[PDB]
């Protein structure tokens, strides 16, 4: 997934994905309080997909230094 | 060392000499399922699901070092070698040099 | 109490009695509280009287 993401820019993508990966995550913790969208391993996509994108950012601070 | 699913003899045990393929492997416990070998009757609770319960006719799996592959040609119980150009360590079966 | 120009201290030893027993005594070194030039300016540190009887400026 990294090569799909370093070609993505900082501004126009980490905005629109991570906040919408939150919109995938946080809409799903609500359903985990209910159980209607069962699909339980869709979480471990989403939170783990956050965790790789957020260390590209902190990498680029070293790359900006 | 054996994978699912190569052709498999049974070295020793109660089923000494039957053959079959591999339904599943369990590599952390070093133990492999074979069809129809160590066929064991098991009593089961009535499930949820199925409601039948009854007796099942599964196989408890077999330790790995009571299992050999075969030459495709001779059909012999043979030990394993390796080293194959453009084959990513594909098994040289002894009585050289058949793959897989 | 440990002075400045040298390293005079309290080196505690024994008071050997007559018909020795013998108990313990602190021996703090001699001191007078006098002016001594340091980084600007003096005053003040304890001095040792061996270092004050002819030495740096009082």
């Amino acid at each position: 997934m990294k090569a799909n993401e370093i070609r993505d820019l900082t501004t126009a993508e980490i905005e629109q994905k991570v906040k919408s990966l939150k919109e995938e995550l946080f809409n799903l913790r609500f359903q985990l309080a209910t159980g209607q969208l069962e699909n339980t391993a869709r979480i471990r996509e989403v939170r783990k997909a956050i965790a790789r994108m957020k260390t590209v950012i902190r990498e680029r601070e070293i790359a900006a230094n | 060392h054996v994978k699912k699913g190569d052709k498999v003899m049974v070295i020793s045990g109660k089923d000494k000499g039957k053959q079959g393929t591999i339904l599943a492997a369990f590599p952390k416990k070093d133990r492999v399922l074979v069809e129809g070998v160590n066929m064991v009757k098991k009593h089961s609770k009535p499930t949820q699901a199925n409601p039948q319960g009854g007796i099942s006719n599964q196989e408890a799996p077999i330790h790995v070092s009571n299992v050999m592959p075969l030459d495709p040609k001779t059909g012999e119980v043979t030990r394993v070698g390796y080293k194959v150009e453009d084959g990513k360590k594909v098994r040289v079966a002894k009585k050289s040099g058949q793959v897989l | 109490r440990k002075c400045v120009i040298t390293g005079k201290k309290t080196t505690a030893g024994n008071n050997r009695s007559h018909a020795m027993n013998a108990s313990k005594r602190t021996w703090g070194a001699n001191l007078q509280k006098v002016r001594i030039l340091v980084n600007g300016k003096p005053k003040k540190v304890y001095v040792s009287a061996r270092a004050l009887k002819s030495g740096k400026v009082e």
Binding site: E23, R29, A33 | - | -
Partner: protein, 93 residues
């Protein structure tokens, strides 16, 4: 950070949630270290339905047991939050 989204976690569906949700007040857990006015940041900016009040309890954990092995529940901090009149609701539906 601190975003509106990570502040909330879930709604809490009890027998209390039956009667309160019909009276324009809703139950939510909040994180352990997030105050009352951070809750008004959520519902305004997540749900778009304006907060009347925020009321925040917190619970200690029941020290449960399994076998020999005894241990304590994680601590919970809920929030009954009221909304305005003429404003909808964006629950499970």
């Amino acid at each position: 950070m601190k975003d509106p989204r990570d502040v909330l976690k879930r709604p809490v569906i009890t027998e209390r949630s039956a009667d309160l949700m019909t009276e324009k007040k809703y139950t939510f857990e909040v994180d352990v270290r997030a105050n009352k006015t951070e809750v008004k940041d959520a519902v305004e900016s997540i749900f778009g339905v304006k907060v009347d009040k925020v009321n925040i309890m917190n619970y200690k954990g029941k020290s449960k047991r399994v076998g020999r092995y005894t241990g304590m529940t994680s601590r919970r901090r809920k929030a009954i939050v009221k909304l305005t009149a003429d404003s909808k609701e964006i629950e499970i539906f």
